[PDB]
Design a protein around this ligand. Structure first.
Ligand code: K0G
Ligand code: K0G
Ligand code: CL
Ligand code: CL
Ligand code: CL
Lengths: 695, 697
């Protein structure tokens, strides 16, 4: 059910032991010694990774190492499509702008932060959640020269439980992290977008890196003199596999949850955030798919834009399914009513006042928040010409020195990036006509961005004519129109440009709405501090976890499938047979790697197949994970690595607000399949040899 | 494999059925010389199965079987199709024109008689052994002089089985006064609608209720207000015990057709010609049609039924090709024929190998013609609406070339034009469909094999399909209403003789008929070789584990209530519940609307004695019985012969079962009788129907 702080391991240990945990408490997490926690890393700021050898080898997801695989790929050596396997340490590829963060120490600094906060004066101050303020407190506690006296180390204080608990983390960061191995994209991203958020899943979502450091194992930026890191702890790899009901646990960095939402915040999330995103993206995606299916060149240009829009669209569909069917609103209402009844009994009305302040703030910002999501989903992300070039003040104060050419060259560079090889003005006009038709029926005239008022005033309500006119008269409507402007440029032409006026007007409204909505966050945050303090005082900091905030957490559960609907059961494990069932050579998402297909045909599974001779691929577990948990190590009852977390099923996305025991699962790539791909597909035996593989 | 057995084969299957769970006595299920459960089974309206469930002739069948009768009695004032129908008294039951129920009174093996009559051979290659006319002459000869007059209501029919190796005579009793008694609303009767056709899990309450009426003596009589309900020989008891996983289940019904004795070459032909062409052509047609329906809500209304009708056999072909590709259907037919050939070599009889060779040679020889036939049939005859545009008859052309018979010819042509260009026809949608269909057709069929008018695409239009189609509509008399009216005001034979649409329609129908006539002679050598082939199979392995192909005659099948795994890590259980109906509810989707009375029953848990042991309300179940088209409405029986459900569909994964039964995938989709009774009781409130049924605890 939760994403527990490392400090909460002591209080959870007995329950974990009753669920199957066999390892000693301090072997998993020791606040003053080496433990399994020391083999977990925050991979590239948004993923989790794990050290799997005494030479700093790191496993994470293929989708986590994707940018590094792509940055090293060329037409001659396409690692993204063919995979990459460095046959020697010297062949491992360095990566610019990469990092791995170890959580060296964690300390509870609540009394210290609360004492420092008493010197504020203004009771409404938001310094208690300010990264700048908390960094000043972290530096004060660590010392005036901490990072100089302790190289590679840094400190950070974060708020938890809405400002009721504070932890200081001592972090060790390594920036020389080299690409060692990756399967082809046909394996690493087998389901591609079709299987995103889907269980059963048959994706071998892994990539391999190596942490490099100086001669003493201290962090150092990329240098050809750097040597692999010998870590204080690494995971042993299990080949025992998994069975239904086996204990499983994860450590990682879940990013965000909303476990303490009021019922009114659940209603807002559904009726505003999700409904608008669903409605607007369904319109955008429908026009886009029609255009992609009718023209193969449009499919090439718009496939990535279409897929990027679909990802959070599917999340919102899954989240709204939970709100509708799992009683998320009702369970938050029961949570707050129980606190209000307990506060009425104790004679402390501040908890009821806090819930009331949240409800009143949610009700007061409704129209503004609806207008913000409507413009953001409808125009800012919905219409490409909304991000067309807007001349800066320096560019207008140049067109009217002979740096008129410099202003035109900068405008041209931005025009060329807007109207790039993937941009179709015809597709964009069709998307804009459908998106603006919806937007204009939902946003009244008095609330419209100034230029959109011309639809009724100048174009007699004809959206098509308004959009046609923007392209026909704009200097960014075509290359010939831009070149005619660039030959005879005037600031008066740019000031009256229909596309410039549209883009400026919709961005002005988007910013005005953002600025009007920002003050509503603070009373909710302050009321949440009181609300969560009451919840903790009433039911204890034992069965209610603090919201995720990109800090190290542990979660435990079992290897278990679930029933998605009446008479349908999805088991706990997928096999290589499922990959072969999904094979479609004329569908780029479901192409099967020939070497992998050969391994399946010959049954060349070695020591990696199960007791029945079937080759496992992935499994699912009742662990509680969210975004940020991609690449997380999945452990046995003995703490051995049995897989990597890489996704979660759409039925469980509502789990960020309320865990769903009968539907929510972490989607994990079986470590046996990872080893089979390294061995039989990559042929990289040296990586198997450096790992500690246990029978 | 797990067959559709003749009633005669019950004796030799009985011990296996008992070991699989059957508890009833053999003669209580089927007795050739007395009353048995077989007497409660009817052929409902020529293509469905039904069953008698009361001593007052009450009959249960599927909602999709009684659909036309429910629709024919529906009006804007009393929409029975939408709201359901529940006659609260026998006098309120609605008569139906052109309806029938057929009882199988007697079945007799007449093989020796037919084979003796056949020996009077004028031609060894004669097809009289399969001729309905010839076999009816033999049936009439055996039954006697004026049998129908001497035994009113009874009729005699002889059918060939096992490719002409076994013959049965059926004495049938037909009743034509069959009245509508009850039906759930369409929201229950066709809950999944087209989306869930061929799908398991299934949540559809596919049932309707009729009543057989007869004269004072229980003898067949056409509709008369003097008719009284039939007191039948036998009726099914209704069980409320339900089903559990692995329970024995059996069905009786009228499966229409199977191809259990196809050679490996016939499986290859079915895949590479029949199925691949139907799949490719319908995918093109459906794709254009769906794009047009999604862009214009008026096009969606006009083309929804045409789109759904095309999709039904398209899905079947996808399911059949999945079995050919993944379940080794070709390989298992090859093993079947190789085993017979090896046995024939040892018996010193080469006629079985010669028979398989004749089938292979005939299949190989007709390949190009059969490919051309399926290409024109799927591509144009079915694919393009203007292919069925009006073609002036020889008498209509003669009438237009000096009498008032000209105005009569124009009125007849106008009537046919008005039926072609009806309220659901869009010339714009049709031109778009034709351009895509003809582009694929012209790519596959060479110039020398094209229907004469299609040669104009290359010769006159420089390969521009769009221009050829545009020209047909721009210049044709049937291209628009204004163009027809201009023709009708000044009609000439010469205008019709040169009409581009008339020439297209005539040309494609001429080619379709020429191909049909060239292909017809190839059927006979295959049929004659199949008689020898199946005779060998029967002599070698016996008429015990190989059932005769279905031929719309009464058969029984047995199996168990069991789910299956459709793919890696996915299991579909044996039973669906009312919960599943509620999960699928979508008020803004006509297919998934939930009846408010049913939704209330679910919320209040007003399940009475119809819910299972755990308090869950069952809806449907699936079984390993072997069924096919014709089995819709079939009674599903317990180990004790009590009614536990009605068969209504089969999953797409098992459609290949018409050639080879698929034990791990093929299932009959059945509506639980507990759900049928729940709907009659709590939705219809028709207590009198429950009271007249014999419901056992
Ligand atoms: O961009 C994506 N796919 C893609 C890329 C190029 C071409 C075609 C498809 N997927 C994606 C996006 C955002 C979140 N998750 C997955
Ligand atoms: O015609 C059908 N459905 C339909 C009718 C009217 C409007 C919309 C849909 N279904 C169908 C089912 C089975 C075989 N053939 C056709
Ligand atoms: Cl370390
Ligand atoms: Cl012979
Ligand atoms: Cl099978």
């Amino acid at each position: 059910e939760g994403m527990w702080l490392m400090q909460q391991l002591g209080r959870k240990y007995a329950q974990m032991k009753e669920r199957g945990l066999k390892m000693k408490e301090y072997d998993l997490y020791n606040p003053n010694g080496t433990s399994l926690k020391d083999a977990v890393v925050l991979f590239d700021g948004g993923c989790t990774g794990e050290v799997v050898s005494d030479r700093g080898l790191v496993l994470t997801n293929h989708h986590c190492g994707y940018d590094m695989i792509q940055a090293h790929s060329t037409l001659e050596h396409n690692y993204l499509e063919n995979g990459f396997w460095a046959m020697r340490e010297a062949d491992e590829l360095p990566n610019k702008d990469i990092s791995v963060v170890f959580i060296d120490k964690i300390e509870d600094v609540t009394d210290y932060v609360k004492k420092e906060l008493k010197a504020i004066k203004d009771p409404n101050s938001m310094d208690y959640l300010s990264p700048k303020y908390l960094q000043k407190l972290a530096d004060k506690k660590a010392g005036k020269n901490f990072s100089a006296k302790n190289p590679g180390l840094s400190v950070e204080i974060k708020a938890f439980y809405g400002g009721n608990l504070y932890l200081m983390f001592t972090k060790k960061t390594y920036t020389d992290v080299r690409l060692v191995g990756a399967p082809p994209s046909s394996i690493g991203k087998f389901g591609a977008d079709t299987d995103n958020w889907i269980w059963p899943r048959h994706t071998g979502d892994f990539s391999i890196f190596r942490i490099y450091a100086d001669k003493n194992g201290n962090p150092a930026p990329y240098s050809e003199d750097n040597v692999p890191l010998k870590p204080k702890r690494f995971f042993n790899i299990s080949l025992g596999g998994v069975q239904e009901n086996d204990y499983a646990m994860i450590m990682g960095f879940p990013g965000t949850t909303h476990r303490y939402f009021t019922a009114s915040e659940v209603d807002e999330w559904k009726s505003i955030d999700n409904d608008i995103r669903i409605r607007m993206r369904d319109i955008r995606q429908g026009v886009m798919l029609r255009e992609m299916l009718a023209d193969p060149q449009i499919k090439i240009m718009y496939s990535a834009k279409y897929a990027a829009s679909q990802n959070a669209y599917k999340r919102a569909i899954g989240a709204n399914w939970a709100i509708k069917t799992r009683g998320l609103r009702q369970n938050k209402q029961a949570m707050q009513d129980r606190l209000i009844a307990w506060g009425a009994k104790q004679g402390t009305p501040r908890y009821e006042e806090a819930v009331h302040e949240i409800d009143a703030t949610v009700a007061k910002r409704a129209d503004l928040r609806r207008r913000y999501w409507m413009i953001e989903e409808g125009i800012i992300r919905g219409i490409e010409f909304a991000r067309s070039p807007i001349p800066t003040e320096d560019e207008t104060k140049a067109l009217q020195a002979s740096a008129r050419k410099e202003a035109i060259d900068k405008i041209r560079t931005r025009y060329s990036k807007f109207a790039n090889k993937d941009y179709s003005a015809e597709v964009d006009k069709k998307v804009a006509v459908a998106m603006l038709t919806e937007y204009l029926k939902e946003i009244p005239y008095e609330n419209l961005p100034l230029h959109l008022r011309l639809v009724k005033d100048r174009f007699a309500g004809d959206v098509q004519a308004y959009v046609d006119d923007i392209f026909a008269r704009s200097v960014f409507g075509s290359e010939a129109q831009f070149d005619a402007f660039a030959a005879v440029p005037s600031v008066e032409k740019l000031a009256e440009d229909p596309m410039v006026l549209f883009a400026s007007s919709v961005f002005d409204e988007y910013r005005k709405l953002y600025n009007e909505l920002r003050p509503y966050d603070d009373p909710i945050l302050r009321a949440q501090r009181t609300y969560i303090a009451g919840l903790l005082e009433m039911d204890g900091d034992q069965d209610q976890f603090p919201d995720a905030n990109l800090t190290l957490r542990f979660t435990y559960g079992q290897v278990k499938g679930y029933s998605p609907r009446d008479n349908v059961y999805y088991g706990h494990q997928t096999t290589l047979d499922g990959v072969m069932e999904k094979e479609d050579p004329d569908n780029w998402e479901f192409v099967v790697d020939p070497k992998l297909k050969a391994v399946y045909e010959r049954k060349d599974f070695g020591r990696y197949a199960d007791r029945s001779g079937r080759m496992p691929v992935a499994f699912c577990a009742t662990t509680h994970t969210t975004g940020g948990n991609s690449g997380s190590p999945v452990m046995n009852a003995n703490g051995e690595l049995i897989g990597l977390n890489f996704d979660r099923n759409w039925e469980g996305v509502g789990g960020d607000i309320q865990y769903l025991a009968d539907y929510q699962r972490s989607i994990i790539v079986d470590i046996r399949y990872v080893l089979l791909v390294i061995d039989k597909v990559g042929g990289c035996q040296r990586l198997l040899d450096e790992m500690n593989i246990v029978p």
